[PDB]
Nucleic acid binder design. Structure first.
Ligand SMILES: CC[C@H]1OC(=O)[C@H](C)[C@@H](OC(=O)N2CCC[C@@H]2c2cccnc2)[C@H](C)[C@@H](O[C@@H]2O[C@H](C)C[C@H](N(C)C)[C@H]2O)[C@](C)(OC)C[C@@H](C)C(=O)[C@H](C)[C@H]2NC(=O)O[C@@]21C
Ligand SMILES: [Mg+2]
Ligand SMILES: [Mg+2]
Lengths: 117, 127, 113, 58
RNA sequence: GGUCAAGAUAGUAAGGGUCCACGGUGGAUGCCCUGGCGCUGGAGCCGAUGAAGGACGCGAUUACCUGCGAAAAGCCCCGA
RNA sequence: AAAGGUGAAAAGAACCCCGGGAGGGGAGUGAAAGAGAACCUGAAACCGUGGACUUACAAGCAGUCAUGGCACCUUAUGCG
RNA sequence: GCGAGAGCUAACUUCCGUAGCCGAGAGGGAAACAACCCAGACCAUCAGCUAAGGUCCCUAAAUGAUCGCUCAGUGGUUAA
RNA sequence: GUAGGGGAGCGUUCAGUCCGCGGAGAAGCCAUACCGGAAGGAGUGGUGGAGCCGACUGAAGUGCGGAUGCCGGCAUGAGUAACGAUAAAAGAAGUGAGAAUCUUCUUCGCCGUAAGGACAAGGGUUCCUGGGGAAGGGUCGUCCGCCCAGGGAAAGUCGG
């Protein structure tokens, strides 16, 4: 018996061509280019998962030394204080305190200054 | 509602103020230029603009507009001094492909594109 | 540049043929419908022809015969039209614009005297 | 061959952008002081053949 | 509230972009069979009594195909 | 070479309207005309009309991740 | 890279020896950059510590501490 | 983790078996935010209008982005180059739904050892009349060498 492609390819093709959403020009309309775009998208996808994790910590650190410097300190110094006050092991959350709770952030600056000098 | 089978016997499908000139021996883009000035204009302005637009697509277009008018009145009861070009568009009909001879033996194909000129009349009504 | 002042659209011989051709037509018919431009160029040549004829003497006649090669039109211009224009300080030619043609899409005009 | 030739297909975008000036300008239609059919400024009214008096037949 | 100054910021779309709705084009896909292929078996020569294959015809009206052959879309006999 | 397909049945659309016509809109037939003779389905490329969000200090393998704005609510209201 | 021949103790040169990497190796660094430096990616996280490299702003983190040097932008184009 | 070797599976057509579904709507097509570790699979809705899913087992013309691949459709260049001898053309009148282009009149201009006329070859009804106006005609046609019908072709001496 004969077993022509019929239905299999078009379905295979529509799947790809639907991942292609706000894809500019041919990248959303023609299969070969839509599919091709996705290979490169795969690189970006797998990489950006572990990248966001560097991206955020960066943002986190930036907010910390901003507030640390508001109370005559800095990230390097502040963190060492909290480290030297072993009791203090915030690390995660610490950026939100600086940004939302200034009263609370000050307390932790004052504790960090002790454990150091 | 019931089902599809029933609906088809129940509600029988109308095309109010619609008329189409099918298989018009003219290129779509060429025809669109004319149709583009007629969109949204009052059926009377449309009739007049057409008589003065120097393009040859003017005649066929005008002919659809008068048919759409007639249809709106006769087949649909609608009142004339309330009429306007709700919608108008040109779609492409089947291309007449012809073979032209060229230098040093080669041939080419001339595309003699056809048009489907449809215009839709509606009653304006501010209120 | 090109700050000249005349207008052809063919070759020397032809420009003169057209001029004389349409001049005979207007003078014979009194009103001709032609292309706007073609009519514009005609206006002065025909206006100048009436002034020559406005002489009345043989020379004035014979001069008209250099451009009007129709025995009858020369008589019409000499003996009929020019005398009627006696106290008109030149100007009998008027151009009206009729409106666009089908084939070329050219704007037509009328020229009458 | 056919010496200067296009390098890449021009996109639907790029092709369309070039046509942003191709739109016809509607004639400025006036209404005839007589026969009351619309006409072109500086031309004889098509309908009556008027231009102050009647010049053209019908 | 108004004039002057200093800042900041919105909306316009000639045309474009993404998405949605509705269409046109085109003939994939599904369904179908009026057409083919293979194997198995049967059957297996035609012609000077003029073949195989054709030309020109034959119709009330006939270009094409069919059937025919100036007795020409048919004539006679037998059977169903 | 390529070329298939109205409908169960031609009941193949009398009559009306715009148009020289082509083409359409109705009326009628039919279960359906969402089958009308460019007659089964009618993908995609491609060409359009309409709507949403948008774009006229911008350097671009066109995505990807993050956040904000607008819109929407039929595996779908914390979820997108 | 190291150890030699060839070659000008030239070549991003050639031909061996030997180790490591690329080939088939993503991630960090070295602006950019197969090979150098660090380190071998089973998947998920809007957690933590470190390597080489860094901590004025672009750009994560001391415009750090102490005793000195250079004043040529040397740093951030080679010799007699 | 490349060549390569090894393992487990997804999907398509056909077949045998079983369970079924379907004009109160099958396949196919279209939309989707659901499921599975992947190939993939389901729900709902929309179209369609007569066939078909699931499970086991069997067999293959069984899975496509590439081959300056083949067939077909459609884009780009682009409303661009061109519209085929630089022998012109003008006006009037007519016809017609419609006229630069068709008819007629008066001019103009180009050939005139030809761009006139008569054979031969070759072509095959192109001839004439009346109609037509899809397509062919590089534009447009009311016209034509195009389309339809009817007609026309005459030999003892001319060629054979
Ligand atoms: C006149 C048109 C005619 O072209 C020519 O004849 C010119 C003159 C000829 O030049 C020539 O052949 N020559 C011979 C040398 C002088 C002249 C030349 C060469 C290069 C550029 N210009 C002129 C080419 C340029 C030459 O290419 C050249 O070939 C060389 C072998 C190598 C060159 N490379 C390096 C760029 C290439 O361009 C080729 C081989 O043709 C014949 C090109 C191929 C594609 C070809 O056959 C075309 C279809 C050709 N046939 C046709 O009918 O039309 C064409 C286009
Ligand atoms: Mg030295
Ligand atoms: Mg391909």
């Amino acid at each position: 018996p004969r077993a022509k492609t019929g239905i299999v390819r078009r379905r295979r093709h529509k799947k790809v061509l639907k991942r292609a959403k706000g894809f500019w020009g041919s990248r959303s309309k023609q299969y070969r280019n839509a599919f091709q775009t996705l290979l490169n998208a795969a690189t970006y996808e797998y990489r950006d998962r572990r990248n966001k994790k560097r991206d955020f910590r960066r943002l986190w650190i930036q907010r910390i030394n901003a507030g640390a410097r508001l109370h005559g300190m800095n990230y390097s110094t502040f963190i060492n204080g909290l480290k030297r006050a072993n009791i203090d092991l915030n690390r995660k959350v610490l950026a939100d305190i600086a940004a939302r709770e200034p009263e609370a952030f000050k307390a932790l600056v004052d504790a960090s200054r002790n454990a150091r000098q | 509602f019931r089902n599809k089978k029933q609906r088809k016997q129940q509600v029988k499908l109308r095309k109010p103020g619609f008329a189409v000139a099918k298989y018009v021996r003219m290129s779509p883009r060429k025809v669109r230029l004319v149709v583009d000035v007629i969109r949204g204009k009052s059926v009377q302005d449309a009739e007049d603009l057409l008589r003065f637009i120097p393009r040859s697509a003017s005649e066929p277009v005008a002919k659809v507009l008068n048919s759409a008018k007639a249809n709106a009145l006769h087949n649909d009861e609608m009142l004339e001094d309330r009429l306007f070009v709700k919608e108008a568009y040109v779609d492409a009909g089947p291309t007449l492909k012809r073979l032209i001879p060229r230098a040093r033996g080669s041939a080419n194909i001339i595309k003699k594109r056809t048009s489907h000129i449809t215009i839709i009349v509606a009653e304006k009504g501010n209120k | 540049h090109g700050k000249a002042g005349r207008k052809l659209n063919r070759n020397s011989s032809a420009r003169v043929a057209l001029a004389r051709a349409q001049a005979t037509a207007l003078l014979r018919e009194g009103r001709i419908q032609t292309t706007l431009t073609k009519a514009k160029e005609l206006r002065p040549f025909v206006e100048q022809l009436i002034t020559t004829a406005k002489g009345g003497d043989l020379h004035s006649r014979r001069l008209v015969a250099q451009d009007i090669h129709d025995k009858d039109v020369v008589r019409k211009v000499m003996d009929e039209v020019a005398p009627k224009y006696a106290e008109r300080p030149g100007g009998y030619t008027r151009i009206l614009r009729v409106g666009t043609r089908r084939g070329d899409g050219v704007t037509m005009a009328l020229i009458e005297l | 061959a056919k010496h200067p030739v296009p390098k890449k297909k021009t996109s639907k975008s790029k092709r369309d952008m070039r046509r942003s000036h191709h739109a016809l300008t509607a004639p400025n239609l006036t209404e005839c002081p007589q026969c009351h059919g619309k006409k072109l400024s500086h031309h004889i009214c098509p309908n009556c053949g008027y231009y102050d008096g009647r010049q053209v037949l019908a």
